Structures are given as C-alpha cells and as structure tokens.
Design a protein around this nucleic acid. Structure first.
Ligand SMILES: [Zn+2]
Length: 259
DNA sequence: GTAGACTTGGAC
DNA sequence: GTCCAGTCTAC
C-alpha cells in the first residue's frame, strides 16, 4: 500500500470507527508492537479511550484517540477491517481492538512486517517514525525547488531519490515507475544529471499521477503504463516494456519514451 | 549502492 | 522446488 491506497483506507475506515470506545486490545503477534516495547502496556493504555479521528502522513495511518495517537504502518500486506466480535477471525489476524458496542477493528498481515507506535498526540510528530518524513506531495510544501535541492547533491539514481521518504513522503514502487514514465525519464540515471526542465516536469507528473490515483481509489490499475507490464507493448509508442533492477527493486520502463 | 533480514503464500 | 512482492541495518 502506497499513498493512494492508504488514503483510500483512511476515508473508508473513519466513518466505521469514529466515536467508538475501546474496551479491550488483544495481541497475537507481539513483534508488531514497537512502542511502548511491552505489548501489555500498549494494550492497557488504550483501554477506555474513544476514537476521535483518522489522519494520514506519508504511508502511515494516524488513529487519533483521547490522549494518544496510534501510528500504524501497513508495510507490504497489512490490512484493516471492521466486524462483529461474535464472529470468528480471519487467518493471520494479529491485533484486535474491541469496542464497547460489540464491534471490533481487526488488523491482518500475512508476512508480519507492519508496525504500531503509540505516543501522546503532541509527541507523535516529533518522535520516530514520523519525525524525519518529507513533505506531503499534494501540498505547497512539495515544489520543484525541494526536489532540485535534494536532487543536485547526490550520486544515486533518480528512482532511489523518489523512494526516500525523507525527500517526499508517500511514493512507492508502483507510482515512482509510473511517474518517471510520464515525465519521460529513465529510472536508473543519476539524480544529479536531471535538468531544471526535467525536474519541473517530473514534479508535475508526480503530483498529477498521485492525484489521479487517489480519485480512482488506488490500484487505477487500468491506467498503468509500465508497472507489471514487462513484455507488453507501450500504450504510447508500441515498444515492448522492460523490467530490470534498480535501487534493489523491480523496475519497469519504456526504453523509447524514457531517456 | 546492491545486498541481508524479517516472514508467508502463490506462480511455474 | 525456486523466484517475486516497505523499511532497518550493514559488507
Ligand atoms: Zn513508449
């Protein structure tokens, strides 16, 4: 889940939990709990608090309670669902929040990579993992200048720069590949080699790509140009789409539209 | 920077 | 059976 999917989860989940009061917290896989370290303390402190809201920062979900904020990162496969506490749980359910009205918020995660941090609302933004995140892509804080400032000061590929949550937050493998294609830039090239003209266009395609994705509720998979299409013809020039590895990850691109 | 880990299931 | 799918930490 990248920014578009997490934003979709946020909008759907909020009306289902706002106003509900936590009666119990059950944890079946302790390692997901990062702070406080003791999973027993994590559970005890939330009991009695009511859900006041749900926000998003980068790829993180921020559950706003009475005094605390629960910061959740879904990583690769984490997922949330609301259901009746009288029914049996689905496989791979690792954390459950039971509400006083008989309902519950279930957290599933097959690979167990997700993390959960709890801090007082006022400390959240100044403590890890939210402290060092870059600006939100769909806000005035993200501008060509910001990208250029970070770009012209590193030898790594442009794709590595965009995957760095401290440069800009919310972009993942799918939308980095799609944005680079639309801007017409090869992923594996030095970020320092990009021109003012290139950086500006990229900034523009990034904003437009992530914006459209949210409106379509995320993967919008019918609107992908390169991700997952290795071997198939380019939708604009017809050249077969290629796949290699860059920044330690699968990377898709068109050798003709991208330079 | 391209790995090395954490950890489970589906494709071929 | 072997290859593929967002951070942290490390040769
Ligand atoms: Zn093309």
């Amino acid at each position: 889940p990248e920014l578009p999917e997490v934003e979709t989860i946020r909008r759907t989940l909020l009306p289902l939990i706002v106003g509900k009061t936590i009666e119990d917290v059950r944890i079946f896989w302790p390692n997901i709990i990062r702070h406080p370290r003791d999973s027993e303390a994590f559970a005890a402190r939330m009991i009695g608090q009511t859900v006041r809201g749900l926000e998003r920062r980068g790829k993180f979900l921020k559950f706003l309670l009475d005094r605390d904020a629960l910061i959740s990162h879904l990583r690769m496969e984490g997922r949330y669902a609301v259901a009746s506490a009288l029914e049996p749980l689905e496989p791979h359910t690792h954390v459950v929040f039971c509400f006083t009205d008989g309902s519950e918020l279930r957290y599933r995660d097959v690979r167990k990579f997700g993390t959960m941090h709890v801090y007082a609302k006022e400390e959240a933004d100044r403590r890890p993992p939210l402290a060092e995140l870059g600006p939100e892509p769909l806000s005035p804080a993200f501008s060509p200048a910001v990208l250029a400032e970070r770009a012209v000061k590193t030898k790594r590929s442009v794709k590595a720069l965009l995957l760095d949550q401290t440069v800009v937050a919310g972009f993942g493998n799918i939308y980095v590949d799609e944005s680079l294609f639309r801007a017409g830039i090869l992923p594996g090239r030095p970020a320092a080699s990009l021109s003012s003209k290139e950086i500006e266009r990229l900034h523009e395609e990034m904003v437009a790509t992530i914006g459209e994705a949210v409106m379509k509720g995320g993967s919008f998979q019918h609107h992908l140009y390169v991700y997952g299409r290795q071997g198939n013809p380019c939708k604009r020039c017809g050249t077969p789409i290629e796949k290699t590895v860059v920044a330690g990850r699968g990377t898709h691109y068109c050798p003709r539209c991208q330079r």
